[PDB]
Amino acid sequence: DPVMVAAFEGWNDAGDAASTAVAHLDREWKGEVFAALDAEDYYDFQVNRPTVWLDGGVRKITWPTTRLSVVRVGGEKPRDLVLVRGIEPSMRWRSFCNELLAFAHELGVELVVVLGALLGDTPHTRPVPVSGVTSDPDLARTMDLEETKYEGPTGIVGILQEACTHAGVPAVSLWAAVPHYVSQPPNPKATLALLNRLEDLIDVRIPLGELPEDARAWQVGVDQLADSEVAEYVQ
Amino acid sequence: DPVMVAAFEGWNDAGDAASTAVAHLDREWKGEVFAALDAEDYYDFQVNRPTVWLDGGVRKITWPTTRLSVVRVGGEKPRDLVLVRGIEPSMRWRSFCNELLAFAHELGVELVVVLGALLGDTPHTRPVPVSGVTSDPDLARTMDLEETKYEGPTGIVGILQEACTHAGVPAVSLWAAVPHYVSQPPNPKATLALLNRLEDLIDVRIPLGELPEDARAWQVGVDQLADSEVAEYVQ
Amino acid sequence: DPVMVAAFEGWNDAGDAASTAVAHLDREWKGEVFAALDAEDYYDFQVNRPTVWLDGGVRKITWPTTRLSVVRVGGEKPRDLVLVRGIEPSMRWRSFCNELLAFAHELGVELVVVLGALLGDTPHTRPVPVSGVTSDPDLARTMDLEETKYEGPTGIVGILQEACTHAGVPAVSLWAAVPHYVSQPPNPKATLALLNRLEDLIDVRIPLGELPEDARAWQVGVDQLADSEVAEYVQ
Amino acid sequence: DPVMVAAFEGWNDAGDAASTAVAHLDREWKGEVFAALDAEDYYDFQVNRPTVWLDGGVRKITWPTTRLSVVRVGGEKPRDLVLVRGIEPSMRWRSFCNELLAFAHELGVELVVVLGALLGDTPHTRPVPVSGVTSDPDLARTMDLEETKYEGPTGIVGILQEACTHAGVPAVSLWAAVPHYVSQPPNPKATLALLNRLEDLIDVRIPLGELPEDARAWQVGVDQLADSEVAEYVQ
Amino acid sequence: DPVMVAAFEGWNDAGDAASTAVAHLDREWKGEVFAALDAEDYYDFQVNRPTVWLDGGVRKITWPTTRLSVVRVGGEKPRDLVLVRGIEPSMRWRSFCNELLAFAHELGVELVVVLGALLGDTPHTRPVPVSGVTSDPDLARTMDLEETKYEGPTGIVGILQEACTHAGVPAVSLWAAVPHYVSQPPNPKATLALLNRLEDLIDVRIPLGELPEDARAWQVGVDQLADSEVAEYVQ
Amino acid sequence: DPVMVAAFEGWNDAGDAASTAVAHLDREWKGEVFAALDAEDYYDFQVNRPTVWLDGGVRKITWPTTRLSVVRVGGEKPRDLVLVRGIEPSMRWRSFCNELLAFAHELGVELVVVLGALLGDTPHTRPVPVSGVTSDPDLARTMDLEETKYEGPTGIVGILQEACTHAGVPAVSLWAAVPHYVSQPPNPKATLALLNRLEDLIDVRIPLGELPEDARAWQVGVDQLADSEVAEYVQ
Ligand SMILES: [Cl-]
Ligand SMILES: [Cl-]
Ligand SMILES: [Cl-]
Ligand SMILES: [Cl-]
Ligand SMILES: [Cl-]
Ligand SMILES: [Cl-]
């Protein structure tokens, strides 16, 4: 059955870890685009300024949006994945989510996985925690999803995962916790943590390309910053 | 390059000839759906009453809409077609058309063909006229498209084909003329006329299934209605 | 717990039987209005022309709409009912229904009953059939709801009752069948049939005012039309 | 001060009398267009099918809409008039009217006159009745506006004239009654009746061009239809 | 006659003084909710992030919105109040205000009072100034409303109070000035100042619960912060 | 032929240089307003707070918007200009631009010039650079428009100028570079630079009123600030 894997830039995307995880799937598997949501309905353009680029001689415009593409995995046991690469919208989240659920429906998506990253309290000197959230009582058993204590502000990931369950489409979101003292956008170690966890859930071989090297580089890069509150945040 | 073939039920669809032509492509080539336009924006539901059907025990609802699917043709020289099967909307035609053009854009559609049928003044005792309309000066040469005298009310086919040219996406619509004295929805002869003409334009083998038989049946069926204004409309 | 009883003029309202049933509840129980849906979003005004009336000297305008009021029943065992009196909208039915469901939610409505009438094949010489429709498996048992064979075009009643179950709000619609040979808008006998059936479902004493007389009058009125296909439609 | 004169095709426009009155002003005074309302918001396009015309070689599309132009009258005592030429919209009348009132406001319009025609009970053998409607208590005195008994369905003219008074912009609509037995769209006699009455209200010389001849022609044309219920409708 | 009392969190709500005043009315009088405005139309959700809470085991979502409830006061001389508790919207203020005015209309609201707080130049060592704003010339006399010099940026309170007068619904807003050097959200003294002034206007006994104590506590709390520009801002 | 000159406050308007250039045209030529875009569709009102002013006694509200007026220039060789004075919208830029293009179309605008200012790296001790941007290959020759290297975030000016070319309406935007170390809103020198360049493009005498003096004042004003990185930014 087809699975939708989504990720959104901005507030639910602590090191761009989640957004680059899906980018990575789209790239490695050469994903074929078939839909972009109409930015006009969702995006404040002063907050999300569109950009101009030059193609041959000519000026062209890129809008913020959420784009849908299909990848064809994988083994002798083949499969379609529906990737959703978006910026978190600034308005009409209920419609936004309905729009994705319509695609999910037309495509017969059987499971929605959403990826995110937040800033947490774990050192770089140690592996990245990934935790799930689901309101599907079935999936809660069917994987080991530890639990959810969380009460507070939520984002489009939270909203989308809830829209799914109200729709009766099984969904789970995976969260990676990124060391808050080192939060700058290139974070290969946490991207990798997400991708590994997704693989166990979906049961799909993911090609990790240059990522395992990148993450090691990052760590033996950060380690050079020698002030050690990481000692404090380990005991 | 990918081609979009569209057709709309109602006023531009004289014997359901055009709408069944695309249905036929979708069926024969086992087309895979990936998007439906949001009916909420386009359809007056008293004019286009949605229906209820029973699936196993359970009630389910079908809305009027315009649905998009992909077919993979064909030879050792393969190709993707994007089929659009719609009801003509009752409102916001400019947005409707923009919505299809966005899909066309994301998918890299290089040519849009729209199919239609109108009631004309040709006998059943004779082959079905199919004529093109284009505002692409190139295509006008590149095929033989005889000409357009037409001035008058237009439909979503007309509008869509014009939205394309303003967008700089080459488009043509093919029209079949259906004998007005015999206009009842099963019209295999004209469906076939459209499909033949499309094949010459797109250069794609179309499997005609039971259609060539159906059309012959229809004619040797109508012929039994023996009042002969068809004699009058031949000289 | 609060119950919402809704009814819509037009296609689901064969003798205005259903719409006058709710009018009757609103009148007899002196229902207090608190909301009208914004007509601007739902109604084609050429199909539903608004009217002008004179209040004292002054011109005033009535729009088609769907209005919500509260009634306080009843015994030493009191209760609130939420009445919905609408015209069937011509557009955006999904939003329309969401709008009613939001009110239902804010008000803590525990059950939605929708009333309708259709033209059927029962004589005036015999009692009016009322049948239910529900997709709540619970209510299906909890009342005796015979069954649903129906597949075909549906209306806002059908849609609303389905929107409820998808929302997880128990809903049922009650249908009365009105003799098609006598379909003219004053139909007290069928209004009464609905009101009786509602009373059994909700367990609420409904004051029937002048209705029981009216219905008898109607029958001893129609009976004078003495051509007897009613004999044919009884055996 | 600038005056807005509006007229709408369809239900408030019995012989196209009102719509051609404004057309006549636009033509004779060579009115300069500056705005069309966005059809997309107001018009059902199956009811108001847009048309295609040929300009030089090229196909071009005309949408139903409501267009605004400025005329510069007149004497040594000059004046601007704002003409509104529309089709009655099928939806969002409240917004439609607000949109016109915004233009009225930006332009500093001090008075809105709306023209209409209905089918009445006066013979062709006699002059055309024109009656006003206003809810401005001032104008009611300031002209002789006989009175308004009318209660019933209204149109966009009625709505617009009421939107004005709620907005505190003085407005009046003038109605001509067109003999119902002769209702076919060319009606120069009633167009002329409107134009005459407008002239008295606005105090503006209107050039009547070929109209006074046309109306005489029409009458000495209808008179030839010699069945005389006009005798009946005079006593 | 029914009175609407509204208050909005954010920019017009200096110590949450105004928003807690209405909360207090809703709580003390056990107000019954009947409507929330559709957040989807008004709220940027990155600015107003919705929250997730746990109910029993289950995740549930709270959106920013403006909610309407009814309270039944009071004496042997009873009364209904309509409370409006909102966040100031970030968009479509004209529609927002129309939406509240529609409720006001359906409910027959005769007067709208809006509460607000701003940061002013009065010491904590002295009572809180409350001033009114009205464009109802009647109310201006009917209460003593000192005057309005104010010209500058306005908020939804300002807009709403103006929308009312244009609608011909009498409205006044009451403003409390909160010492700018002590602006942190718990401000019982100013909440109390609003409630007292409202009581004089509406002529309704308001139960002040723990507030009179709270305000005294606050003052004998702030007084401990002993730098005395309050001496400077008194002479 | 009529020319549209537009300018937008905010991000594309470095010293309010561009916005005051158009203000200056509107003032000097006594431009007559005929349309404002509906703020409701485009503006976040917390970011663009509307203001209240007093007219005689009475409170009145000004919304952020984009307003259109006509000026009649000029010589024995007369001309109409359409001025557009706006704030950059925060949402629906595609519609915003379509709305302006509709006016352009109704008015028969043949060329659109958009004015802007950015912060650049030129000293106050030297003339203000103005550079053009166009995607009209014709205009690129027809004026000397040096070239465009620019790739990056764009604004409504960029978007509008691109919407024009896609629409087949020739458009160019003129940019002035304002010394970043002196960016405070009164910048007469750069306003003047824009106006001069516009004059050469449009071939229209622009009355500069007090501006040439103002700019000199500004420079002999800034020069007094005597830290000299301007020496550094000249070599
Ligand atoms: Cl979450
Ligand atoms: Cl056509
Ligand atoms: Cl049904
Ligand atoms: Cl009327
Ligand atoms: Cl204010
Ligand atoms: Cl740019």
DSSP string, F13-38: BTTSHHHHHHHHHHHHTT-EEEEE--
Query: ∠ CA F65-F67-F72 to the nearest 5 degrees?
Result: 165
Pair F59, F52: CB distance under 8 Å:
yes
d(CA F85, CA F25): 11
Interface touch D47/C46, C-beta < 8 Å: yes
Amino acid identity for residue D138 in this structure: D
Pair D147, D90: CB distance under 8 Å:
no
User: Would you tell me the crossing angle of helices C93-107 and C156-167 to the nearest 10 degrees?
Assistant: 50
Greatest CA separation for chain E: 58
Q: Which domain holds residue E118?
A: 1-235
E runs forming strands in chain B:
3-9, 32-36, 51-55, 58-62, 66-74, 78-87, 111-120, 130-134, 152-153, 171-179
Q: For residue A149, what is the nearest residue in chain E, using CA coordinates?
A: E54
Q: For residue E61, what is the nearest residue in chain A, using CA coordinates?
A: A159
Segment holding E231, helix H or strand E: helix E229-232
CA of C185 to the centre of ligand 4 (A): 27
d(CA C91, CA F131): 50
Check the CA dihedral D31-D32-D37-D40 and report its sign: positive
Per the structure block, which two tokens stand in for B229? 């204004």
CA dihedral defined by F180, F181, F186, F190, rounded to 10 degrees? -50
DSSP state of B90: S
Q: Based on C-alpha coordinates, what's the Rg of chain E?
A: 18
Q: Which residues pair with F54 in a beta bridge?
A: F59
d(CA E150, CA E159): 14
Q: Which residues pair with F171 in a beta bridge?
A: F112
DSSP state of C13: B
**At E63, is the secondary structure helix, strand, or coil?**
coil
- Chain B residue numbers with beta carbons less than 8 Å from the beta carbon of D87 are none
Pair D85, D7: CB distance under 8 Å:
yes
Could you tell me if A42 lies within 8 Å of chain F, comparing CB atoms? no
Q: Which residues pair with B215 in a beta bridge?
A: none
d(CA E160, CA E98): 9
Q: Measure in Å the smallest separation between the Cα of E61 and chain A Cα atoms.
A: 8
CA of D117 to the centre of ligand 4 (A): 10
Residues 198-227, chain B, touching D (beta carbon < 8 A):
none
d(CA D130, CA D114): 12
Tracing tokens 């369809």 back to the chain, one arrives at D10
Helices and strands of chain D, counted as H and E runs: 7, 10
Per the structure block, which two tokens stand in for A53? 């680029």
Pairing of strands E3-9, D152-153: unpaired
DSSP state of A128: P
Give the number of whichever ligand sits closest to the CA of residue B175.
Answer: 2
Give the number of whichever ligand sits closest to the CA of residue A150.
Answer: 1
DSSP state of B13: B
Segment holding A222, helix H or strand E: helix A211-222
User: Would you tell me the crossing angle of helices F93-107 and F156-167 to the nearest 10 degrees?
Assistant: 50
Tracing tokens 């709710």 back to the chain, one arrives at C22
Query: ∠ CA E226-E228-E230 to the nearest 5 degrees?
Result: 115
**At D212, is the secondary structure helix, strand, or coil?**
helix
d(CA E45, CA B205): 51
d(CA F133, CA F155): 13
Segment holding B144, helix H or strand E: none
- Chain E residue numbers with beta carbons less than 8 Å from the beta carbon of A44 are 44
Interface touch D153/C54, C-beta < 8 Å: no
Q: How far is CA C194 from the centre of its chain?
A: 8
**Among residues E41, E59, E43, E35, which one has the least CA distance to residue E9?**
E43
**Among residues A4, A7, A174, which one has the least CA distance to residue A86?**
A7
Could you tell me if A35 lies within 8 Å of chain B, comparing CB atoms? yes
Tracing tokens 């204590």 back to the chain, one arrives at A149
Burial-class residue A147 by CB neighbours within 10 Å (0-12, 13-18, 19+).
exposed
Tracing tokens 């009145």 back to the chain, one arrives at F60
DSSP state of C88: P
Could you tell me if D147 lies within 8 Å of chain C, comparing CB atoms? no
d(CA C217, CA C223): 10
d(CA C82, CA E70): 15
Amino acid identity for residue F206 in this structure: I
Pair B184, B15: CB distance under 8 Å:
yes
SS3 content of chain B, % helix, strand, coil (to 5): 35, 30, 35
Amino acid identity for residue D78 in this structure: P
- How many CB atoms lie under 10 A from the CB of residue F194? 26
Task: Count how many Cα atoms sit within 13 Å of the Cα of residue A115 in the half-sphere of its side chain.
Answer: 34
Burial-class residue B158 by CB neighbours within 10 Å (0-12, 13-18, 19+).
buried
Buried b (16+ CB within 10 A) or exposed e, A115-144: bbbbebebbbeeebebbbbbbbeebbeeee
Interface touch A91/F90, C-beta < 8 Å: no
Could you tell me if D92 lies within 8 Å of chain B, comparing CB atoms? no
Segment holding E100, helix H or strand E: helix E93-107
Pair F13, F86: CB distance under 8 Å:
no
Count structural domains, chain D: 1
Looking up residue E30, the CATH number of its domain turns out to be: 3.40.50.10900
CA of C155 to the centre of ligand 3 (A): 7
Q: How far is CA E68 from CA A94, D11, E33, E85, in A?
A: 21, 40, 6, 7
**Among residues E107, E119, E124, E88, which one has the least CA distance to residue E231?**
E124
**At D109, is the secondary structure helix, strand, or coil?**
coil
N- to C-terminal Cα separation, chain C: 44
d(CA C110, CA C101): 11
Phi first, then psi: what are they for C91, rounded to 5°? -140, 175
**Among residues D148, B210, B107, which one has the least CA distance to residue C55?**
D148
**Among residues D178, D198, D173, D200, which one has the least CA distance to residue D188?**
D178
Measure CB to CB from residue D153 to each of C49, C54, C91 and give the nearest one.
C49
- How many CB atoms lie under 10 A from the CB of residue F86? 24
Give the number of whichever ligand sits closest to the CA of residue A155.
Answer: 1
Amino acid identity for residue A216 in this structure: R
Segment holding A202, helix H or strand E: helix A188-202
Measure CB to CB from residue F154 to each of A44, A47, A51 and give the nearest one.
A51
Tracing tokens 């006061």 back to the chain, one arrives at E73
d(CA C216, CA C36): 35
Pairing of strands F66-74, F3-9: unpaired
Pair A79, A25: CB distance under 8 Å:
no
Sheet of B51-55, strand order: B58-62, B51-55, C152-153
Tracing tokens 């120069």 back to the chain, one arrives at D188
**Among residues E180, E189, E185, E184, which one has the least CA distance to residue E212?**
E189
Could you tell me if F150 lies within 8 Å of chain A, comparing CB atoms? yes
Segment holding E98, helix H or strand E: helix E93-107
SS3 content of chain C, % helix, strand, coil (to 5): 35, 30, 35
Could you tell me if C175 lies within 8 Å of chain D, comparing CB atoms? no
N- to C-terminal Cα separation, chain A: 44
- How many CB atoms lie under 10 A from the CB of residue E44? 22
Pair F188, F208: CB distance under 8 Å:
no
Q: Based on C-alpha coordinates, what's the Rg of chain A?
A: 18
d(CA C44, CA B46): 10
Interface touch D45/B152, C-beta < 8 Å: no
Helices (H), chain C: 17-28, 93-107, 137-142, 156-167, 188-202, 211-222, 229-232
**At B88, is the secondary structure helix, strand, or coil?**
coil
Phi first, then psi: what are they for D15, rounded to 5°? -120, 30
Q: Which residues contact F199 (CB under 8 A, 6 or more apart)?
A: F205, F206
Buried b (16+ CB within 10 A) or exposed e, A68-103: bbbbebbeeeeebbbbbbbbbbbbbbbbbbebbbeb
**At A174, is the secondary structure helix, strand, or coil?**
strand
Q: Which residues pair with F130 in a beta bridge?
A: F176
Q: How far is CA E108 from the centre of its chain?
A: 21
Q: How far is CA E109 from the centre of its chain?
A: 17
**Among residues D143, F116, B91, which one has the least CA distance to residue C90?**
B91
Q: Which residues contact E210 (CB under 8 A, 6 or more apart)?
A: none
- How many CB atoms lie under 10 A from the CB of residue E75? 8
Give the number of whichever ligand sits closest to the CA of residue A51.
Answer: 6
Q: For residue B100, what is the nearest residue in chain A, using CA coordinates?
A: A35
**Among residues C151, C152, C158, C109, which one has the least CA distance to residue C133?**
C158
DSSP state of C181: G
DSSP state of F203: T
Q: Which chains touch E (3 or more CB pairs under 8 A)?
A: A, C, F
d(CA A52, CA A56): 13
Query: ∠ CA C219-C224-C225 to the nearest 5 degrees?
Result: 105
Long-range pairs, B140-149, Cβ under 8 A, ≥24: B143/B172, B143/B201, B145/B172, B148/D54, B148/D59
Per the structure block, which two tokens stand in for D41? 């918001």
Could you tell me if E67 lies within 8 Å of chain C, comparing CB atoms? yes
Check the CA dihedral C11-C13-C16-C20 and report its sign: negative
**Among residues B160, B136, B156, B164, which one has the least CA distance to residue B148?**
B136
CA of B116 to the centre of ligand 2 (A): 9
Interface touch F44/E11, C-beta < 8 Å: no
Buried b (16+ CB within 10 A) or exposed e, E98-129: ebbbebbebbebebbbbbbbbebebbbeeebe
Cis peptide before F108 (omega within 30 of 0): no
User: Would you tell me the crossing angle of helices C211-222 and C188-202 to the nearest 10 degrees?
Assistant: 140
Segment holding A79, helix H or strand E: strand A78-87
Q: Which residues pair with B179 in a beta bridge?
A: B120
Which of D52, D53, D60, D62 has the highest number of chain B CBs within 10 A, making it the mutation to test binding with B?
A: D52
- How many CB atoms lie under 10 A from the CB of residue F210? 10
Measure CB to CB from residue A95 to each of E40, E43, E52 and give the nearest one.
E40
**At F232, is the secondary structure helix, strand, or coil?**
helix
**Among residues F161, F220, F156, F166, which one has the least CA distance to residue F188?**
F220
**At B95, is the secondary structure helix, strand, or coil?**
helix
Cis peptide before C56 (omega within 30 of 0): no
Interface touch E52/A151, C-beta < 8 Å: yes
**At B55, is the secondary structure helix, strand, or coil?**
strand
DSSP state of A39: G
**Among residues F158, F209, F157, F172, which one has the least CA distance to residue F188?**
F209
- Chain D residue numbers with beta carbons less than 8 Å from the beta carbon of B148 are 54, 59
Measure CB to CB from residue B135 to each of D46, D53, D59 and give the nearest one.
D59
**Among residues C1, C68, C28, which one has the least CA distance to residue C195?**
C28
CA of E54 to the centre of ligand 1 (A): 12
d(CA C4, CA E223): 55
Q: How far is CA B164 from CA C180, D60, F48, in A?
A: 49, 13, 37
CA of C158 to the centre of ligand 3 (A): 4
Q: How far is CA E167 from the centre of its chain?
A: 21
Segment holding A152, helix H or strand E: strand A152-153
Interface touch B40/C153, C-beta < 8 Å: no
Pair A112, A175: CB distance under 8 Å:
no
E runs forming strands in chain D:
3-9, 32-36, 51-55, 58-62, 66-74, 78-87, 111-120, 130-134, 152-153, 171-179
Q: Which residues contact E150 (CB under 8 A, 6 or more apart)?
A: E133, F52
Q: Based on C-alpha coordinates, what's the Rg of chain D?
A: 18
Check the CA dihedral B51-B55-B60-B63 and report its sign: negative
Interface touch E35/C103, C-beta < 8 Å: yes
Interface touch D91/C54, C-beta < 8 Å: no
Per the structure block, which two tokens stand in for A233? 């945040």
Per the structure block, which two tokens stand in for B170? 């080459």
Which of F32, F33, F34, F95 has the highest number of chain D CBs within 10 A, making it the mutation to test binding with D?
A: F34
